[PDB]
């Protein structure tokens, strides 16, 4: 308890903002994550030694890929931290414990390829997990790490509590499969607009946490423009590599993965904000009003992409 994590003055202030960027110093991200855990969960939620050992084994099992990397893991966790701090009365002890950990682990051992490439490639993981292929792999990787000697960060929970928290994490990680988002958000929009949404309903909680996980996972669209623009370059570096690999299989890639369609990125972004991002943050804002700043920043970046299309901005 008496060893408390502290951040420099700028970080201490700005980490509370939804649009906080965790910065380029890799060696500071473990400290940043522990701080967010101590403040959102509590200093006694975890033994510091085990948490640190766990954090470092998770980092080791993320790969050196352009976007789906350790920095994305901490970025997604930070967005969850801001949502939990601005809605602190709405979540349980086990949910605070589970959710920052789920966010850190959500893309474990990502190779930079979609579930669809793994299917067309006939990768072994597509045989093992027929849907949410990579997401079932991320969870499996989370369990492996939790089961390493000195890594049971949930060692003080009862058997039944340990099982609840692993189930929170499992559901949260699976919800990051964007193919499941479309259904989940439609269900939540209906439930909100008929007044049937009920946070005491566990199946409704599950859906809200899923939407929170989508929001956190896409949160690059909720940063200041310079962050948003530079992060878009990182995901296309992955998408275009996948499109190359599709071409090697004799398959025409979809437009977002073809590097020859590079000049159409601003319009692809516009399409993505209109069909996915805006609806996502819009629905989340209705259920959790304090998440408003994510929707605001998502709208600001939509205007930036329109300015790029009109040739008033470059990218
Ligand atoms: C990091 C940046 C935003 N982002 N966060 C998560 C995820 Cl997925 C995305 C994201 O960018 N998704 C996305 C979805 C559909 C798209 N269609 C096109 C496109 C491109 C060229 C020609 C025609 C179409 N680009 C796309 C990008
Ligand atoms: Mg993922
Ligand atoms: Zn992700």
CA distance 137 to 120: 17
CB of 83 closer than 8 Å to CB of 288 = yes
Q: Which atom of ligand 1 is nearest to the CA of 221?
A: 3
Please report whether residue 8 resides in a domain.
no
Domain with residue 82: its CATH number is: 1.10.1300.10
Biggest CA–CA distance in the chain, Å, is 60
Q: Which of 155, 64, 46 is nearest to 101 (CA)?
A: 46
CA distance 300 to 311: 17
Is 68 an active-site residue? yes
Please report whether residue 176 resides in a domain.
yes
Q: Is the CB of 237 under 6 A from ligand 1?
A: no
E-state strands within 119-203: none
Please report whether residue 18 resides in a domain.
no
Please report whether residue 1 resides in a domain.
no
CA distance 304 to 186: 27
Q: Is the CB of 66 under 6 A from ligand 1?
A: no
Domain count, the chain: 1
Q: Is the CB of 232 under 6 A from ligand 1?
A: yes
Q: Tokens 């801001």 identify what position?
A: 82
> Within its chain, how far is the Cα of 111 from the centroid?
16
The best mutation among 75, 269, 273, 298 to test binding of ligand 1, ranked by most ligand atoms within 8 Å of the C-beta, falls on 269
Q: Is the CB of 220 under 6 A from ligand 1?
A: yes
Residue 41's domain spans which residues?
28-310
Both tokens of 221, joined, read 């669209």
Q: Crossing angle, helix 278-287 and helix 202-217, to 10 degrees? A: 140
Return binding residues for 3',5'-cyclic AMP: 68, 269
Q: Tokens 């990051």 identify what position?
A: 176
**Nearest CA, atom 4, ligand 1:** 218
**Nearest CA, atom 5, ligand 1:** 218
Resolution in A: 2.3
Measured on CA atoms in the order 52, 58, 61, 65, is the torsion positive or negative?
negative
Q: What spacing in Å lies between the alpha carbon of 173 and ligand 2's midpoint?
A: 8
**Nearest CA, atom 8, ligand 1:** 218
Q: What spacing in Å lies between the alpha carbon of 276 and ligand 1's midpoint?
A: 10
Please report whether residue 19 resides in a domain.
no
CB of 106 closer than 8 Å to CB of 173 = yes
CB of 37 closer than 8 Å to CB of 100 = yes
The length of the chain is 315
Q: Is the CB of 235 under 6 A from ligand 1?
A: yes
CA distance 152 to 141: 14
Please report whether residue 10 resides in a domain.
no
CB of 21 closer than 8 Å to CB of 223 = yes
Please report whether residue 13 resides in a domain.
no
Q: Which ligand is nearest to the CA of 273?
A: 1
Q: What spacing in Å lies between the alpha carbon of 302 and ligand 3's midpoint?
A: 21
Q: Which atom of ligand 1 is nearest to the CA of 220?
A: 1
Please report whether residue 17 resides in a domain.
no
Q: Is the CB of 290 under 6 A from ligand 1?
A: no
Both tokens of 299, joined, read 């709208």
List C-alpha distances in Å: 233 to 126, 162, 230, 240, 266. 28, 39, 5, 10, 11
Measured on CA atoms in the order 116, 121, 122, 127, is the torsion positive or negative?
negative
Half-sphere exposure for 146 (CA within 13 Å, toward CB): 21
Q: What spacing in Å lies between the alpha carbon of 194 and ligand 3's midpoint?
A: 31
Q: What spacing in Å lies between the alpha carbon of 272 and ligand 1's midpoint?
A: 6
Q: Which residues surround ligand 3, an ion (CB under 5 A)?
A: 107, 217
Q: Which of 80, 71, 115, 104 is nearest to 231 (CA)?
A: 71
């Amino acid at each position: 308890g008496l060893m408390q994590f502290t951040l420099p003055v700028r970080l201490c202030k700005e980490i509370e903002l939804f649009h906080f960027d965790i910065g380029p110093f890799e060696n500071m991200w473990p400290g940043i994550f522990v701080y967010m855990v101590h403040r959102s969960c509590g200093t006694s939620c975890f033994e510091l030694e085990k948490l640190c050992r766990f954090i470092m084994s998770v980092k080791k099992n993320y790969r050196r890929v352009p976007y789906h990397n350790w920095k994305h893991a901490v970025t997604v966790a930070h967005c969850m931290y801001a949502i939990l701090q601005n809605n602190h009365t709405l979540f349980t002890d086990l949910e605070r414990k589970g959710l920052l950990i789920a966010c850190l682990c959500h893309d474990l051992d990502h190779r930079g390829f979609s579930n669809s490439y793994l299917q067309k490639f006939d990768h072994p993981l597509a045989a093992l997990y027929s849907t949410s292929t990579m997401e079932q792999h991320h969870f499996s990787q989370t369990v492996s790490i939790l089961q390493l000697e000195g890594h049971n960060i949930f060692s003080t929970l009862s058997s039944s509590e340990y099982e609840q928290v692993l189930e929170i994490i499992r559901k949260a990680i699976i919800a990051t499969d964007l193919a499941l988002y479309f259904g989940n958000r439609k269900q939540l929009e209906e439930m909100y607009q008929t007044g049937s949404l009920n946070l005491n309903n566990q199946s409704h909680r599950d859906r809200v946490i899923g939407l929170m996980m989508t929001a956190c996972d896409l949160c690059s669209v909720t940063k200041l423009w310079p962050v948003t623009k530079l992060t878009a370059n990182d995901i296309y570096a992955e998408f275009w590599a996948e499109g190359d690999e599709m071409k090697k299989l004799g398959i025409q890639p979809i437009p977002m993965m073809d590097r020859d369609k590079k000049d159409e990125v601003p319009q692809g972004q516009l399409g993505f904000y209109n069909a996915v991002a805006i609806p996502c943050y819009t629905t989340l804002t209705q259920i959790l009003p304090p998440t408003e700043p994510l929707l605001k920043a998502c709208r600001d970046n939509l205007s930036q992409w329109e300015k790029v299309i009109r040739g008033e901005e470059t990218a």
